[PDB]
Design a protein around this ligand. Sequence first.
Ligand code: SPH
Ligand code: MYR
Ligand code: MYR
Lengths: 5, 5, 60, 60, 268, 268, 283
Amino acid sequence: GSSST
Amino acid sequence: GSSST
Amino acid sequence: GAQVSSQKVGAHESTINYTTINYYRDSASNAASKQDFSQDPSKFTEPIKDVLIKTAPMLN
Amino acid sequence: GAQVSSQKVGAHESTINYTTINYYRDSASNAASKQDFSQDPSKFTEPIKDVLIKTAPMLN
Amino acid sequence: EACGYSDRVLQLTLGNSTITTQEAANSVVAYGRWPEYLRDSEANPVDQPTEPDVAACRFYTLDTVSWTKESRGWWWKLPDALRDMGLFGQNMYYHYLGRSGYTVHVQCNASKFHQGALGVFAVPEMCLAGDSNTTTMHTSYQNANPGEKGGTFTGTFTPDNNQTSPARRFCPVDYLLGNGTLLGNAFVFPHQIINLRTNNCATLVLPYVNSLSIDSMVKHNNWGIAILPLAPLNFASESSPEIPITLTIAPMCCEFNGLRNITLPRLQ
Amino acid sequence: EACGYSDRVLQLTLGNSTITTQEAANSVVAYGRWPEYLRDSEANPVDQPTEPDVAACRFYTLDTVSWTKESRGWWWKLPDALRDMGLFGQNMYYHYLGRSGYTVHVQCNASKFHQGALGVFAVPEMCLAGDSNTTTMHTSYQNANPGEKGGTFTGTFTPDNNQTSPARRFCPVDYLLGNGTLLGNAFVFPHQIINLRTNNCATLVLPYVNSLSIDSMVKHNNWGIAILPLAPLNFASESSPEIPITLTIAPMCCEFNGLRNITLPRLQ
Amino acid sequence: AATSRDALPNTEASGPTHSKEIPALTAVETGATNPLVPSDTVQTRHVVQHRSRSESSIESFFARGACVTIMTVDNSASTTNKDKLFAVWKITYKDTVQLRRKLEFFTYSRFDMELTFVVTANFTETNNGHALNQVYQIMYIPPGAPVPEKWDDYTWQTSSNPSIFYTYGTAPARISVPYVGISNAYSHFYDGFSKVPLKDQSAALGDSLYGAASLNDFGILAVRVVNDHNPTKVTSKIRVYLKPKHIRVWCPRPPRAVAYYGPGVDYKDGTLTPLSTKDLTTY
Ligand SMILES: CCCCCCCCCCCCC/C=C\[C@H](O)[C@H](N)CO
Ligand SMILES: *C(=O)CCCCCCCCCCCCC
Ligand SMILES: *C(=O)CCCCCCCCCCCCC
């Protein structure tokens, strides 16, 4: 879905 | 939606 | 319908991924996944009826 | 498979973000993240066997 | 230490050999990496390695050279300088592959009335420039590899003009570090300085460095040792002072792969 | 074994070397003792030993000799026969002390129509008799130590009569085992027989045997290999048959003490 | 965990001093650089440091495309003493100087290669006769694959070699290449030879170039105009731009101080004086 760094 | 391999 | 898979990362700068969406109804239109399998060579390298034990005499 | 990271905002008009999606299987095709690390210079600036204390005599 | 221990006084022991010094300026470990054997996760040739341990990882002393007012500098290559050193050299020429780290100990004492300073540099891949301006990359194997005598630097580039029978040797100009870069910057390489008022030796511990885990020691040199007078020798008012410089070097954690008959190189 | 395993078919692997055989008569381990490194409780020189492991503990093949109707026998000494064999020989001459065990594999094939039998004996301290009847114990170092060529037995004692310049060599008479004892009793030493109808090789695994834990390999030989025709070579009705005999020997568990400069012996 | 864009350390305020602590005295013989900061030798104020080293990270230092070669091709009628011109180039960063100098601050490197191709064409002769839009084929020929001898021979089929068919006047072409070295890193310097000269061998037979390792390190690019020829002549140039992405570097070196003179570290007489006159006591 989504990775958030 | 999404498949993840 | 998005497909998310991991890249095998070679030179480096967690798992890096990439996304794929099929745009067409016909599977023939799809790109190649390159997610392929391997198999043992045996059907070509050991096609003999009686299993070979390599430490044993091949002829007995 | 979207990757969301923050920008270091320089001139201004909360955290502003940007999105990245990898389109290819090979990590070599990817853009550079620029999310890089720093390290201490020591292996080049203090390569000595006995740790240097700067207030102390370097030779003792 | 209150029990006498000093940065200036060291003892090094490898195999059946010991070095003592009473005037060191600490010692250097190149890039902070101590020598190691090749790890399984980085291994490449699959045959059982040969590890000669104390038979080869011991201090070998090379031929002593002489430092004078006219000295421009000296150079050596590793493993080349050790190719004829006891069982290290034997193990080297019997195998296709070899890797090794080193303790390099440069020795030069004088007196409180002498002055001068040697920059001692260990350079990974110390490629040196040739003598020709009609051809590039043409220094012969024989001239590239002096063995223990090493070579020297010069203050002047002087091109080989015999085109019939070219010298095929290096022409390493000192302020260009023999490679077209400025000597004042050689301090980014692991180094020590023998400044005669301060210390009488330099000690460099070198890891095996290469773009491979193991390689041909006979085809390829991993490290270069360059010694240059940063401040010239001087003593009292003598016009012609001289003091000796001695190199003692020990292989460390060396291992060899690909055993066969011994290599007999064309060295002259 | 019901999966084919046989007493006659063996594979031996030491270092980068493998021997196969399809006609063995089992193999022998001398005095039931397999080779071992020197244990701390039996140790004597205190310096760190050199243990070359695969670099020296591998199969070396000596020069092939020829068996004929007139052959009286051949002999070799260990470690002498291996003194010029790769890194084993190097390690041997660089150190004062050395100890080693061995796998000895004697090779000799023929055909179902040939006949003959070689007794292959490994003798601890195989002292051989000299050629003189005016002097005793006078065989020179050079003649005592043939290196890989070995020596031979004779059916006749023939005394050296040149007193001006004595031959100073052995005169080893076959039925006296070259040492004044009867050959028929040599079977109390560890042995095998190559009887051509039965087998085409002999394999002897020898421990280091000595009255010391370690000794001078250059001054002293621990084992002697004696090969004698117990039943002579014969084939069809040929007057002059010949078949080759090859020795391949591997050092096992060898270690060396007392490293210095290399020994350069007077061998001629 | 410290990142390239993190701010550098704050200056801490510091006052007068009178002690046995001697930061200022040191000994460069040891091989170390004295790690001093202004508060070690002067009085300082507190400053909150905002500056970062973001633009000098190895990646940011190299994150630019650099021209490494110019290839010339034409689209002319092949005639008995001269054929239609196709170009062949041995891949390297050493034909130009700027990227070479930057890479050579280091001994070894690893990176993914981004190649961008800028293509330009022109008429060479006066006739008012025209040409139609050209398509170019850029074929990568890895060491071992057959090199083209003619603009139209069988090798341009490319069943296995990667090729780019570039259309004139469209966006500059671009492909990526993984780290393809046969070693664990690319060697910017190789102090050695590819052959050992043996004594039992002739000198000629044991000879090789100093500092060269694999003869054809990376192979060739072969470029051609795919179009048949026009009555009028058109010449084209393919400018190749190399950017090292995802890069790592080891063992720093002093930069090239005198002009490059070939693929090795050699230098030419007459080029060895980089420094200019300046008096010791003149600002
Ligand atoms: C259709 C276009 C395909 C282009 C394919 C190019 C593949 C070859 C990549 C070459 C890698 C060159 C790396 C640079 C040089 C080396 O670092 C040094 N000279 C030492 O190894
Ligand atoms: C599964 O695909 C659900 C998510 C949809 C994500 C956005 C799709 C991007 C545009 C695809 C257009 C359709 C192509 C025929
Ligand atoms: C993770 O990526 C799940 C969300 C998908 C978001 C839309 C993707 C946008 C189009 C990408 C096409 C695929 C590229 C090969």
